[PDB]
Design an enzyme around this catalytic site. Sequence first.
Site, PDB file in Angstrom:
ATOM      1  N   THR A  84      46.016   9.083  32.305  1.00 32.14           N
ATOM      2  CA  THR A  84      45.236   7.865  32.466  1.00 32.14           C
ATOM      3  C   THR A  84      46.084   6.736  32.999  1.00 32.14           C
ATOM      4  OG1 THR A  84      43.583   8.328  30.718  1.00 32.14           O
ATOM      5  CG2 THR A  84      43.823   6.102  31.434  1.00 32.14           C
ATOM      6  N   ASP A 354      48.910  17.723  24.911  1.00 30.02           N
ATOM      7  CA  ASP A 354      49.563  16.487  25.333  1.00 30.02           C
ATOM      8  C   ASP A 354      50.812  16.313  24.494  1.00 30.02           C
ATOM      9  OD1 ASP A 354      47.587  15.884  27.288  1.00 30.02           O
ATOM     10  OD2 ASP A 354      46.546  14.445  25.964  1.00 30.02           O
TER      11      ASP A 354
HETATM   12  N1  LIG Z   1      50.318   2.834  17.692  1.00 30.67           N
HETATM   13  C1  LIG Z   1      50.117   2.379  18.948  1.00 30.67           C
HETATM   14  N2  LIG Z   1      49.889   1.066  19.199  1.00 30.67           N
HETATM   15  C2  LIG Z   1      49.694   0.624  20.461  1.00 30.67           C
HETATM   16  N3  LIG Z   1      49.701   1.444  21.545  1.00 30.67           N
HETATM   17  C3  LIG Z   1      49.913   2.766  21.430  1.00 30.67           C
HETATM   18  C4  LIG Z   1      50.141   3.318  20.096  1.00 30.67           C
HETATM   19  N4  LIG Z   1      50.330   4.630  20.257  1.00 30.67           N
HETATM   20  C5  LIG Z   1      50.231   4.915  21.578  1.00 30.67           C
HETATM   21  N5  LIG Z   1      49.977   3.786  22.259  1.00 30.67           N
HETATM   22  C6  LIG Z   1      49.802   3.696  23.717  1.00 30.67           C
HETATM   23  O1  LIG Z   1      48.598   4.361  24.110  1.00 30.67           O
HETATM   24  C7  LIG Z   1      48.721   4.817  25.453  1.00 30.67           C
HETATM   25  C8  LIG Z   1      48.085   6.189  25.564  1.00 30.67           C
HETATM   26  O2  LIG Z   1      46.762   6.166  26.102  1.00 30.67           O
HETATM   27  P1  LIG Z   1      46.042   7.601  26.150  1.00 30.67           P
HETATM   28  O3  LIG Z   1      44.645   7.430  25.611  1.00 30.67           O
HETATM   29  O4  LIG Z   1      47.001   8.571  25.504  1.00 30.67           O
HETATM   30  O5  LIG Z   1      46.081   7.906  27.734  1.00 30.67           O
HETATM   31  P2  LIG Z   1      47.473   8.293  28.422  1.00 30.67           P
HETATM   32  O6  LIG Z   1      48.184   9.029  27.319  1.00 30.67           O
HETATM   33  O7  LIG Z   1      47.178   9.159  29.610  1.00 30.67           O
HETATM   34  O8  LIG Z   1      48.059   6.975  28.866  1.00 30.67           O
HETATM   35  C9  LIG Z   1      50.220   4.810  25.773  1.00 30.67           C
HETATM   36  O9  LIG Z   1      50.502   3.742  26.693  1.00 30.67           O
HETATM   37  C10 LIG Z   1      50.914   4.351  24.525  1.00 30.67           C
HETATM   38  O10 LIG Z   1      51.805   3.343  25.022  1.00 30.67           O
HETATM   39 MG   LIG Z   2      47.353  11.121  24.921  1.00 34.66          MG
END
Ligand SMILES: Nc1ncnc2c1ncn2[C@@H]1O[C@H](COP(=O)(O)OP(=O)(O)O)[C@@H](O)[C@H]1O
Ligand SMILES: [Mg+2]
Lengths: 487, 487, 487
Positions: A84, A354
């Site tokens: 994404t 993932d």
């Molecule tokens: N606890 C958290 N708080 C804020 N952001 C988070 C947290 N965990 C993961 N993320 C962020 O969420 C995003 C992941 O979005 P996701 O739905 O996994 O799509 P993708 O993995 O392809 O970017 C990543 O940018 C990560 O930085």
């Molecule tokens: Mg993910």
Amino acid sequence: NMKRYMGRDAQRMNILAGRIIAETVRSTLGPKGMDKMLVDDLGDVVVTNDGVTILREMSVEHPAAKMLIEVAKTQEKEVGDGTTTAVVVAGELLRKAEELLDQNVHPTIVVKGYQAAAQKAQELLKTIACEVGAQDKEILTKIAMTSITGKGAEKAKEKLAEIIVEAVSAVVDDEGKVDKDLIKIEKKSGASIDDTELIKGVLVDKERVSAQMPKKVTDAKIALLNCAIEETASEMLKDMVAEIKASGANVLFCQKGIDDLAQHYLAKEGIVAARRVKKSDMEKLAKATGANVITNIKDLSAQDLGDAGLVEERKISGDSMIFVEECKHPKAVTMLIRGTTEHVIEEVARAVDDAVGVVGCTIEDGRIVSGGGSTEVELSMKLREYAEGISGREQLAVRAFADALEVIPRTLAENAGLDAIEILVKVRAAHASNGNKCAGLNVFTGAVEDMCENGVVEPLRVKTQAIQSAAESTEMLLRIDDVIAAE
Amino acid sequence: NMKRYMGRDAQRMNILAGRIIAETVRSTLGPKGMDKMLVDDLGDVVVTNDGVTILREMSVEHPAAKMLIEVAKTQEKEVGDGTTTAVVVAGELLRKAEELLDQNVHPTIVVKGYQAAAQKAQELLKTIACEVGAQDKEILTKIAMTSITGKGAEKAKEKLAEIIVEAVSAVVDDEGKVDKDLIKIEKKSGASIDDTELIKGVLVDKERVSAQMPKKVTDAKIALLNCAIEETASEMLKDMVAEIKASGANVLFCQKGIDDLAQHYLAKEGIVAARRVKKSDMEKLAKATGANVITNIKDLSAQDLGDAGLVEERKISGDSMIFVEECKHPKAVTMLIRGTTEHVIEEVARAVDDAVGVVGCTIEDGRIVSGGGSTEVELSMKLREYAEGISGREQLAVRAFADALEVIPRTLAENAGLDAIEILVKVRAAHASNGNKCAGLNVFTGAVEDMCENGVVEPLRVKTQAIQSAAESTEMLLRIDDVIAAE
Amino acid sequence: NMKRYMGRDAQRMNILAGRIIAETVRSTLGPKGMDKMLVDDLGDVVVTNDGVTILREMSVEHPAAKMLIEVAKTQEKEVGDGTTTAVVVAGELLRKAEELLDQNVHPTIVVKGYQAAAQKAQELLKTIACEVGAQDKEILTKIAMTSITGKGAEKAKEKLAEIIVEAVSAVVDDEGKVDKDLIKIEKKSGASIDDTELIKGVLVDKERVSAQMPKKVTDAKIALLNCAIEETASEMLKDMVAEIKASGANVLFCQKGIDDLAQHYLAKEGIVAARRVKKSDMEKLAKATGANVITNIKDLSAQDLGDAGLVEERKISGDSMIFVEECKHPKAVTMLIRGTTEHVIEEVARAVDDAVGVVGCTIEDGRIVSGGGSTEVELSMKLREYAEGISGREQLAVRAFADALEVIPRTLAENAGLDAIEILVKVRAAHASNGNKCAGLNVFTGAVEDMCENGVVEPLRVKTQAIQSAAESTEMLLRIDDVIAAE
Ligand SMILES: Nc1ncnc2c1ncn2[C@@H]1O[C@H](COP(=O)(O)OP(=O)(O)O)[C@@H](O)[C@H]1O
Ligand SMILES: [Mg+2]
Ligand SMILES: Nc1ncnc2c1ncn2[C@@H]1O[C@H](COP(=O)(O)OP(=O)(O)O)[C@@H](O)[C@H]1O
Ligand SMILES: Nc1ncnc2c1ncn2[C@@H]1O[C@H](COP(=O)(O)OP(=O)(O)O)[C@@H](O)[C@H]1O
Ligand SMILES: [Mg+2]
Ligand SMILES: [Mg+2]
């Protein structure tokens, strides 16, 4: 004959077509992000938060967009997570790109300066990426946990991250890479999600060929036959059947056929056997038990046998399968995923894929960075100053490229419900040449925290791969001024 | 029955049809030139700045135009670069040609004087082409770098020109030509463009036939079999399998089939093998390692084996292939191209093909000239004076032929955004019998510079081939006064 | 049921349909004549100035016209040049014929008097045709040069006429005819037209069957096999392979198949070989080298081998072929035609065919006449006086037949742009019982000159064949008074 778009029309067409498949996944970004349900023409539904599958499995037709899907399609290929974000940034580069084109900057100057900044951001990341031990089994689990969240915090079951880390750690091919295909993923219903477990061995979708055979063996010795145990009507088969009992094997997996005479002679001996096992299931067994694929039944040595601490036929979720579990030194492993309904299971599975990617990515790489949109605000301010040391228009490009990356912190805020604009300022002050480089927005907290300490981490490969494929493709799109559509 | 065009209508039809496919690529000319995205009827997209592919892969129907595509199609065949310029000039000769026809000059007089000038410009180039050493490995790289630019300055990665020069220098068949087909070009995703590398050997899209075989061998000795290693059920194959271990070969590439019995006897010996390798991949291996294609397994001498300093099965971009790299004396070589998405890779590839052409062209020819539209303004003023020494109408033709060539400097300016008309005057004064012959427009500078010194150089074959195929075809078109279109 | 035309309608229909395919090629006549571009229903284009192909390859439907195309179709068959002039005259006989029919002259009287004059003009030419030596290699070249001009003065490359004369002189079958099919014509791109050359041997579109074979041999000895060199799996082929090395042959062309065992034994010996060569390419090789087509490999004598001073595999214009050049005593020869694009090449080729015809025609015949419309004005005034010694109406016919022939001088003037009517008077005064018989219009000069001295000459066969097939066919047309068209 037939449709052609000129100059500012063709650019606006593509830049817009791009921003649109980008805006189509903007909403899945982050833990406080939502899922898309996606029917086709066959009433066939599929629910997911996984970026690429969403894009892949929808009928996208416009040629420009067809190519942002390229970016997501190779992000998944070279990382596993952050599909994404690669697409999202790619959209935001096209957005910022037309602010310069509508100021009469030449496309080739924009694409020059985008390249320039993509170049910089690549070595700028290299330096702001913490090192980690390929077996730092604690950090590996903060990484696999950060991956599963973002597909919703509620899938982030603690004892699931742990299972994954362990299971990717097993299949490491010294040295020193992870074959994402050595970890078999199987899905079977149950009353579960929590019941998903690691099976250090292989799950085979066959059943003992003769009902008279044992339906459990412990500490078994396994003979894998690439051969075909024939028969006729004159026991030319007590030969083949007693040459196998000669090596000491109480279990036998055959890829070809086992005739009906050599099925009775095995049952009679106490040896369990399955005929016509998938060739893929044969290599799975070759590696996980420590066995050997023999084509010549005569050349069946007594060391071409594997070893599993249990071989059993179970009925699990209705269907009856042959578990070859509790192995000693697995070079193949099975993740048994479970959940109440089918699409519930199927999305827990996309979540595990993932995880297994970003875990494999850390072990392989060794470097990681801080999530939460953290290293984007860092990477963006650093890029913004590199931008001043640039004479000429191409400077505007570079600032635009720098402003582009702030789309990740921004949309992460949006979906959480918070005020994107403010939060972006807080997180931009906390990066002012002092700390933090790890200072990012926690969408649960609501306030900006230290992401490295809250355990929010991501392989470096996620932001490098994503930022460059987003650069490379939008660069090519911008070079385009004429389109020639037929039919 | 059914459509016919008479006299001034048939000429205007063709001359117009011509100028139109010409104006269709005018926009790709130069580094500050743009790309065409080109869908078909299958949603199949392809983005490129490469002149000929643009022309080829679009449904051009009109018979006149079908024949300017001839010019581009043979330019690519006999050079590699300068497909757009051959077409572009061809258009501009048709444009100037009707200024004379609309002044009642007979077509046969025009075509007489066009021929006359094409003749002159051919020996006029011979003399204004600098000599170069077939291994002037520095100049070869200025040539390969001038080629990649023009497909955008941003593809002009320095360490990519170098790779190409080196790789064309390897496959030189003393004496003394370059087989553009001895350099294998392979495309695999990765997070790259910069990761593209030279592999002195061959990439084989197969995998070790038995999983039990080695998956790495160093300083290996390679046996290529044009034969088929059969078996049955009585080890008639320890013969074939031990006759190969007799020559000392720890690696074997077979074009036909390797039976399942002779797959186990090889794995047992330590010999790696692949069955059913492309016949094309067999000749690639024949030349690059220094091996020999043997049809009789008995006649397998111990000197029919090649030599590569590594033979390994890797997974690269998902797929698993057999790398036969780090060879000693390659007469075949592989360019591994890499880039984030697929069309990003595919256009970096078309750029490498153009490089490999003009590099091969310098080595082969030995003579080169100065780009930037330089030797066109030279070649055009010289032609203009040759033009006065001509009595009769045919003089007008010759001047028009001379004025035609100025279309390259002109459109190079256009796309850059500069004022074509002025720039043409500056560059025309700087050629006034004194210097420079190398005085041309730098589209980055903005001002006229010394192209030979700025490293802007082009094989002579680019301007000779282009100017003559542009002359020959438009000459024939002009002779045409009646058309007979059916259906 | 369904369409019928009566009397003056059916004659007007046919006389008109005739004049129309005549007026369709009037424009190609002479050097200052134009070309027809000729698409079909498949976007397939073909450009030419050659009369018959223009006629042939257009969908002509009307039955009358279908039959003037008869005249052109046999002119090409029996001469090679002057296809347009035979048709053109045929039209102008029909034109003059209706001036008499519209004066109520009976068709049968017209056709009587036309026959009468065709008879006369046949022996009237016999006497005004200069003699020439079958090897007057200087005059032969003025003839082959006068042929190529008229397809445009600009194809009239001096060193091309010379090549052709030489190449027709070679294939002369003593005694004493020229087989127009013994001169193989091959077309391959290059940056050329000037690069077209004479190859005293054969070009074969095959390649050495084993890559291990030599790729050059000099002063080679050639064995042509009409047999099939089989094999199996037990070297029944060292026999066949060493029986060939027994005759001393280091090159072998096989029409049938060469098994994979007898491909390795040849490579091993140093003998180059090609399998499955066209049967037509086998006879080409039989004659040009001085070889022999052997069906029995046992009966391979040591004098059934040809001799060529070079046999080499080259890549020329991309494709790789086997040149068997520099032969000693060729009874087959190859004209290698070359030019930048494909239709440029294809029309140079049609020009060479016309040359080869008129050259073969002089050698064969021995008599020639003066072009430029010269012997038409001669032949016409002589016929006009013969016309007075005729009592009856049939006289009008004979004058009309005499006036008809002036259509060649007339249209040659037209296309050049000159005033047809004046020029015709000048050229008619210069024939007033004194000289010249060689007094014709030079379309470059603009004024009437001595064509025999300006090197404008044409086999006699061009004017005899043309004048009689024009007479015979229009004679038959005029006899027609009812037509019966269906569907
Ligand atoms: N606890 C958290 N708080 C804020 N952001 C988070 C947290 N965990 C993961 N993320 C962020 O969420 C995003 C992941 O979005 P996701 O739905 O996994 O799509 P993708 O993995 O392809 O970017 C990543 O940018 C990560 O930085
Ligand atoms: Mg993910
Ligand atoms: N640095 C440069 N400055 C100005 N012109 C250049 C430069 N490098 C290459 N060129 C010109 O760009 C042209 C190449 O256009 P291109 O897009 O490659 O199409 P083609 O190669 O078929 O002509 C060549 O005329 C070359 O003279
Ligand atoms: N130098 C010349 N000047 C004037 N007429 C010429 C010259 N050379 C050839 N011709 C004439 O041109 C005619 C050839 O026309 P062409 O286009 O060859 O059609 P065809 O050969 O079928 O008649 C011949 O009549 C010949 O007499
Ligand atoms: Mg180029
Ligand atoms: Mg002719």
